[PDB]
Design a protein around this motif. Structure first.
Motif, PDB file in Angstrom:
ATOM      1  N   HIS A  22      34.006  34.481  39.265  1.00  0.00           N
ATOM      2  CA  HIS A  22      34.947  35.146  40.153  1.00  0.00           C
ATOM      3  C   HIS A  22      34.924  36.644  39.882  1.00  0.00           C
ATOM      4  N   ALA A  23      34.876  37.443  40.942  1.00  0.00           N
ATOM      5  CA  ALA A  23      34.674  38.871  40.790  1.00  0.00           C
ATOM      6  C   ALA A  23      35.909  39.539  40.202  1.00  0.00           C
ATOM      7  N   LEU A  24      35.677  40.676  39.564  1.00  0.00           N
ATOM      8  CA  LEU A  24      36.708  41.446  38.891  1.00  0.00           C
ATOM      9  C   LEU A  24      36.471  42.919  39.153  1.00  0.00           C
ATOM     10  N   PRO A  25      37.497  43.755  39.012  1.00  0.00           N
ATOM     11  CA  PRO A  25      37.309  45.188  39.211  1.00  0.00           C
ATOM     12  C   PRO A  25      36.738  45.872  37.979  1.00  0.00           C
ATOM     13  N   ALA A  26      36.133  47.020  38.224  1.00  0.00           N
ATOM     14  CA  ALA A  26      35.496  47.794  37.179  1.00  0.00           C
ATOM     15  C   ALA A  26      35.256  49.208  37.684  1.00  0.00           C
ATOM     16  N   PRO A  27      36.318  49.975  37.939  1.00  0.00           N
ATOM     17  CA  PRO A  27      36.140  51.363  38.373  1.00  0.00           C
ATOM     18  C   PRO A  27      35.594  52.269  37.292  1.00  0.00           C
ATOM     19  N   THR A  28      35.602  51.829  36.037  1.00  0.00           N
ATOM     20  CA  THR A  28      35.072  52.600  34.928  1.00  0.00           C
ATOM     21  C   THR A  28      34.346  51.659  33.984  1.00  0.00           C
TER      22      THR A  28
END
Lengths: 50, 245
Positions: A22-28
């Protein structure tokens, strides 16, 4: 009429995509945390099986 | 769980698959000195990474007619790294050690070593053989370096004491059917909280084969023995110019 049992418990007719992930955020990039020395058995991240 | 182990201190890291449990010499861990026990007033320095890491000394060979070896600690590291280049500057020293030994072999080889840690292992000469002639051991047998020194009379450990009783110290074996390494942890063993690192030599590692190596032709004869070790909880005090010896 679906009176037999092998038709009730059947897996036929499954329009769903079982996804393990399941996808997750990663702006950094990931923030490296602190660590210290460990001298234990069992725990052994280096040894992998490829 | 008890076989696989890993040892991460410093930038470095060790793995092993066919090992045994870990030993803590004389039942306790290293430590920094207390403000009650201590006597000197100067503030020490405690680098905590540049010194407390695994150094690798030298790789011996184990033939069938081998007798044994010893190394004196912490003499082994007085010319190696930021450890040694602090121990020359300063005068006072305190540390522990972790000690890891390697010897691998297949499932057709056989043998057993004894990896012991003896404090204040004075060396004694043979008195000329006759007994009357007083002698003394030279400087290259009491502080032989990192290249180690080989025993001549291992049944008495070159000090009038048997090897049969060396297990009362912190000991391990390397039976090549079972294991392939020996991990020993040791605290700071001395009557004084600080002591020099160049003159005094607090303990000696010994490696003596009891059951000799044996195999059959067509098999690899070279069976090295490697010695790895790491300082821990290292302190220093009394800064001044560098002293080789």
């Amino acid at each position: 009429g679906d009176r037999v049992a092998d038709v009730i418990e059947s897996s036929i007719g499954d329009s769903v995509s079982r996804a393990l992930t399941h996808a997750l955020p990663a702006p950094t990039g990931q923030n490296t945390q602190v660590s210290s020395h460990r001298l234990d058995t069992g725990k052994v991240p280096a040894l992998q099986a490829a | 769980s008890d076989r696989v182990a890993q040892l991460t201190i410093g930038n470095s890291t060790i793995t092993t698959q066919e090992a045994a449990n870990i030993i803590v010499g004389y039942g306790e861990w290293p430590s920094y000195c207390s403000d009650s026990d201590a006597t000197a007033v100067d503030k020490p320095t405690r680098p905590d990474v540049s010194v407390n890491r695994f150094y690798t000394l030298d790789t011996k060979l184990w033939e069938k007619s081998s007798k044994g070896w010893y190394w004196k600690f912490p003499d082994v590291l007085t010319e190696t790294g930021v450890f040694g280049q602090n121990a020359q500057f300063h005068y006072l020293y305190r540390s522990g050690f972790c000690i890891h030994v390697q010897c691998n072999a297949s499932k057709f080889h056989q043998g057993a070593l004894l990896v012991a840690v003896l404090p204040e292992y004075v060396i004694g000469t043979v008195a000329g053989g006759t007994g009357t002639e007083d002698t003394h051991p030279p400087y290259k047998q009491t502080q032989p370096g990192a290249d180690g020194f080989e025993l001549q009379h291992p049944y008495v450990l070159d000090a009038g004491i048997p090897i049969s009783q060396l297990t009362v110290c912190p000991h391990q074996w390397i039976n090549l059917r079972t294991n392939n390494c020996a991990t020993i942890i040791v605290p700071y063993i001395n009557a004084l909280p600080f002591d020099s690192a160049l003159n005094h030599c607090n303990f000696g590692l010994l490696v003596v084969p009891i059951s000799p190596l044996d195999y059959d032709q067509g098999a690899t004869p070279v069976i090295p023995i490697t010695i790895t070790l790491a300082p821990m909880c290292s302190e220093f005090a009394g800064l001044r110019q560098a002293v080789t010896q």
